[PDB]
Symmetry: D2
Subunit: 410 residues, 4 copies
Amino acid sequence: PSLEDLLFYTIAEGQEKIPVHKFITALKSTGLRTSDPRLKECMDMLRLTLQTTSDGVMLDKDLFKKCVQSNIVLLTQAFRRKFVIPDFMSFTSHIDELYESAKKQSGGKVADYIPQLAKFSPDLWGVSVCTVDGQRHSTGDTKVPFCLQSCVKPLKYAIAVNDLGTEYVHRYVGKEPSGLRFNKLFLNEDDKPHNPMVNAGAIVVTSLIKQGVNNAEKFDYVMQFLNKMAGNEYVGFSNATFQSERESGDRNFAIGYYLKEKKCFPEGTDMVGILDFYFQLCSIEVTCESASVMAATLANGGFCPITGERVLSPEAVRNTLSLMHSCGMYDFSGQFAFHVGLPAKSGVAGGILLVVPNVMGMMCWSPPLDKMGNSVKGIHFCHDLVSLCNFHNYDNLRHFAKKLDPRREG
Amino acid sequence: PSLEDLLFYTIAEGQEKIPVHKFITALKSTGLRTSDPRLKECMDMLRLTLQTTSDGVMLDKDLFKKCVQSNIVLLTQAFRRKFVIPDFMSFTSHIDELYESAKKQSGGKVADYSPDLWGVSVCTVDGQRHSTGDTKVPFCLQSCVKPLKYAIAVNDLGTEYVHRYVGKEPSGLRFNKLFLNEDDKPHNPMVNAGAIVVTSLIKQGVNNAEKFDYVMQFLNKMAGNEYVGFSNATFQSERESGDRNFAIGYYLKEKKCFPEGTDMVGILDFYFQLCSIEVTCESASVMAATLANGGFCPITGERVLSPEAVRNTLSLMHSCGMYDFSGQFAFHVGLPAKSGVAGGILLVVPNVMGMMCWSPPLDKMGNSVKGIHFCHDLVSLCNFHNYDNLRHFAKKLDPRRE
Amino acid sequence: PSLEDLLFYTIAEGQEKIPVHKFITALKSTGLRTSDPRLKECMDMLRLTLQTTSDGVMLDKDLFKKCVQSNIVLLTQAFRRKFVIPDFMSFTSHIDELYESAKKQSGGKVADYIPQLAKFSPDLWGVSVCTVDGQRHSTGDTKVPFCLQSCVKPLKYAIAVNDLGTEYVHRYVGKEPSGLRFNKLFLNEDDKPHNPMVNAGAIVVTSLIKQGVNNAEKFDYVMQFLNKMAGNEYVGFSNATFQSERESGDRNFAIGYYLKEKKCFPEGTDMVGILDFYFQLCSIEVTCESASVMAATLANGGFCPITGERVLSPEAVRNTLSLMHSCGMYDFSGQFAFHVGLPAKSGVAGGILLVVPNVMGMMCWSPPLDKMGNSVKGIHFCHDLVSLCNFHNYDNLRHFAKKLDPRRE
Amino acid sequence: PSLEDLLFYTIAEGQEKIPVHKFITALKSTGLRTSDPRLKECMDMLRLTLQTTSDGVMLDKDLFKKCVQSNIVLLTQAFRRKFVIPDFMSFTSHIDELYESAKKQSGGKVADYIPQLAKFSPDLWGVSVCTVDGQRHSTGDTKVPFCLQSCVKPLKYAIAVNDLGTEYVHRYVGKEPSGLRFNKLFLNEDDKPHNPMVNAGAIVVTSLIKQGVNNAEKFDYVMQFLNKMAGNEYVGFSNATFQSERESGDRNFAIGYYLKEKKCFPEGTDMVGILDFYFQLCSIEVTCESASVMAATLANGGFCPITGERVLSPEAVRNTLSLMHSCGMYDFSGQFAFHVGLPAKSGVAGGILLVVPNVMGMMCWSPPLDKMGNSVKGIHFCHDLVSLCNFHNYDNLRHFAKKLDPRRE
Ligand SMILES: O=C(Cc1ccccc1)Nc1nnc(OC2CN(c3nnc(NC(=O)Cc4ccccc4)s3)C2)s1
Ligand SMILES: O=C(Cc1ccccc1)Nc1nnc(OC2CN(c3nnc(NC(=O)Cc4ccccc4)s3)C2)s1
């Protein structure tokens, strides 16, 4: 036997040769993009042969084997329906219906407290999916950059835990939701911020990362980390959002001074500098597509699904998912945990970073926010998604009534 | 081909005939008990055969088929290693090590309002069973009954109705003192005020004796008809010592928290009865396993709770099940669990197993010292944490694998 | 000289004899009522003289001395303008204006959680004054009985402090207002109710009075005490209000069980009986007139101004006034202390028991309550009263701007 | 007759002439000091005379009249026992015993969070009295300057109410104590600081004074105001304390940014400059003697007793006294109101500014603080002071048991 040959026969369907377009089309139907970083050698060899061979455009068992040899494992998993969602085409058509249904929820108000948030249209709405196997889908405004804002909080907490361990980080920040009106206190009674997902907690976490080096390096370090989480897709920076965040951060300066007086930072912290670093981190830009890969990295135990690279330790990923479960959605976190049961994090630019553990990551984005600060369409989408699929953390994988399970076939 | 014969040959060893003891020994090794209610027909057929011919007592291909035909599917899944934990005996030896390690945590004080009793029982979603320690000693559910009666109410009345009367969130680590949240509902079903309201929703219109019978019948189904009892002694002491519960009851009454037509004073008495319901570790593990198994009881196959009832209960055990330790427990253990003052910890590993840990000595937060220690070790050892990853899990063992 | 004689000359006005009506009219103008218990011998002797002497109706120096001799000390202070408010007639005409101004404030809702409060007309409005010298004035519906309700809380706290002392009583109840939303908590962090003026605190205080004896005695004992505080004017009991208070007291039973579980009562307390005693104390009846005398006893350091009897210890009175100042007006207590600056206690029946220390006591009553549970007209009356007179706790007695001071001439 | 004449004879004792020293000793006997600003013309005349006739040094009726005539009203009133405390010498010996009793309470910890407070000896202890008539007494370390710190909060709140009125000022700050652990919150539910006596409230109040003008003038204005309040006795500034307060005021900066974001300041406020002004105000220095005069201005309805000058409106003084009663002693405020019943304000330097309305002002100073931030010796002195005298706000002026009343003879 031979695996490249075994693939060859499955796609050849009996003909002597496989047209290249027929291989490309079958590959995309699995959900992979041809630009997948794990498929580069196969795509390079295909492009090279379609130069050497303008006598084609067809691959015999020879030529096919030459192209797929270096990525044969992933291609076999792709073609033998071994991905976490085997019938990805059916699933993306469900994603699209959920998208269109959320598209009609027109309520909410865009964040307008700084000019670069009232700038974004209330009609932008995009959702991107990235499975733990790298299968991709996007519908709507998914290549429009927007700032992570508080969607960055779980990402930088994961970085802190990855670099420093659970015990160190939670010497400085708690691990629990505060309560439906302790949402207003900066500190719990151990004089720690309640958890990493609130502003006082995120400010302390920001103060833990890459200590001793300057802010430009700290930022480069977190940015390269975000690059790996996103499989090197778009991670950027909105200096416009940064200038306004630093001009409108009286509440954060109030938090910073409160934390300083209560001795909440690591020894030797320049609190005013940390606030500026914190302001920078909330102005980091993503698209729905690149952010979906970040969420998928968290869905995938800390491995980036489109590169195969280990980005975060399991401990960092587990802790981050645990705190997104209970603290990720502002005052809606309890209701969201109950009704959706998925680790998620919202931001004031309208993003919702969503993790379906072991299945996929998602970024939902629509700027108009509800009274709690969460994107109206994203929240609607996340309720619909769990209504349709047995993705709720406490759905059962065997008995799930009439929910669809996209991990199954028939 | 044929499934009974193929099963016969896998057990046959090539040999012509199967000793009956060899089949029992092979069956017990899968984790199933011979008393399993779903194997009743097969054990019935074996009992009849083990009279017919005692110069055997050997099952030829014909006679083996005679006994196993009506349970062949369940027996095949057991023998073809298809259960949720395939190498079940390896797993139970890990349970034993975990048990012995918690056995050395002697601290804590029994609720006094025995310190050397300690048992853990496992029931997987496929009905594989294991116990270590004092697992057939009855004890009262106390607050371990709160998720069970909440599931019953959601099962019979739906989420929307039940949560007109009770919230669905933890209160906060010093809002644990308030009976009502901001909408004048108790915070969640896992606190006493919430459980009192939930008690007032079950089987309205009938008297408390019927209500109790109905809850007992429901708990029987949850436990696949294993031990469910009632401790009148605990009931009397709970009711003579329930000043705080009367305080909660009167507070709820004044604040219009009960369904219209509620006799609050009677509900408190019903409530005292429910916390005095008795289980063992073994029967309670089946109850937990029903919650682990989407509401189907694993040793009978019966649909006991709606998926909605089970999901809601697991969600609220995640965040509210372990008193002031609920947040730390959700973070560090990541499993839906519920503790009780008699020393019980009802533990659910969704899609895998249910467990009851029982050890009366409680820590400062009211949770059984040994149980809490066991639950930390268990997730430290296996990738059972709610937010462990199933593919990349570092050095943890995954008992679902081979 | 002679005290009766010189007083005789002060009233005689050169005339040889004093008409009896001329003496009575001058006596009433000081603010005393002829029925004042400290004037009994003089009034009995006057009535007797108008029988023996239907050849009158005039009192010569001999006869005037015969009638006023045994109350000459009080009568001299009355007639020599020595009372705390010398020009009482002027003062009561201000009280009347204040009354009429508050009468036009028609807002508020009569308490209706029990039928005996809901029946009370929203248009009843009465204010009664009793000075620390026993001078009296009333305008409006001042002889209509109503239940003290929470106006009894400072009185029973005073009884407890009088009988048991500050230190003992405040082992069981604090001495501070709770804060603008610790009003829903039954206990402060030391597991005591915050102060005696909240329900939980009053229930605990109720549990301290005459421990060991049964409720009928306890009630008689407290009633004896209120009688003296009111100079034996009307103190009654509304059994109808008691039956309704006890059948609808879920929150008080919730408080009762919480306190028992937290061991807030003295050892040997029958908590459910204490709740029953507590409901009885809230159903005790007064009028504006009689309750004003109770307030005046508190205004007068524990002596009842119309009998001269010592009723409460100064320690009991100071403590009670201190806590009415800061905790007497429900959630309005801080605003009331700031703007009115007087020890006061409201109740759900519309009463406001009001104390101007060293000056007078008042009961204001009008059933309609505002959102905080305080009588709309009483609250309006009490603001106006301090706007007009330098009675605020922290008004100055020497420099008080445009305010009137009724203690001066 | 003649007022200078009668007075001369009362001091003359029938004798021919009054030696000047005998008049001075007699005057101090009333409690007034010879440096009293209202006695300047008389002391000027005495100084001129103590040159003319150094064959003396004695004043005949003519010469005495020459000296005392322009201060005759105050001098008679002093010499005829007409002051608020007639037997002032008796009173100061009670103060001395109270002083000596508190001197034996050596506990407490000197504030050390800035090096200017840790410099102060734990053994410094001073008490100064100034009555509403200007009678003066001091025992201990009463001319050692220390900073007001939070004792300034009532003074600047009084200024703000005096300049802007009650209604405007309390658009920005509440009028109530918060509760014993809403003490960690910066704002009440109306997004106002709870009261002017907490840091958040004092910071907002600072932002109201002389708006629109820069900080240097604002500070000058407050210093002139404090000068009037102290009858021009010692008011200074500790720049060292100011520098330390401002580099270590993280919680105050946290409060400032919180108030700014919640829009708690008047339109056009530079919050960071207000914090700087606020730190300056807490570094203003007094002695026990001068601060006692400021307290006496508050005891005297806004008139400074040693100058006769109107300094604050009665409204400003009433409000400040009201909020010192309930909010002036940090977490001890409720206990202090209950047990001492006097408006007071403590500060971290160990000062307690104490007001007995209509009677006297006091400054107590001893750096060692208790766990709540109040001076251990000051707190002890203030309890003893009211255990001894019927100065409690709700003591009765007529029936006060065995307490001493220094207003009586
Ligand atoms: O005092 C202590 C100890 C302590 C006291 C003070 C400081 C620290 C510690 N522990 C006590 N625990 N219970 C008490 O008596 C109650 C049973 N009570 C309920 N009252 N109100 C409820 N529901 C709402 O108010 C709605 C709501 C409004 C705002 C926020 C949240 C909810 S539930 C009060 S005292
Ligand atoms: O000290 C601790 C430790 C502790 C935690 C839990 C229990 C006990 C002890 N925790 C913190 N304490 N202060 C903090 O920084 C703040 C500046 N803050 C303000 N937040 N909110 C304000 N104003 C209103 O909310 C309106 C309002 C609404 C309802 C009631 C009262 C007021 S002012 C918080 S964190």
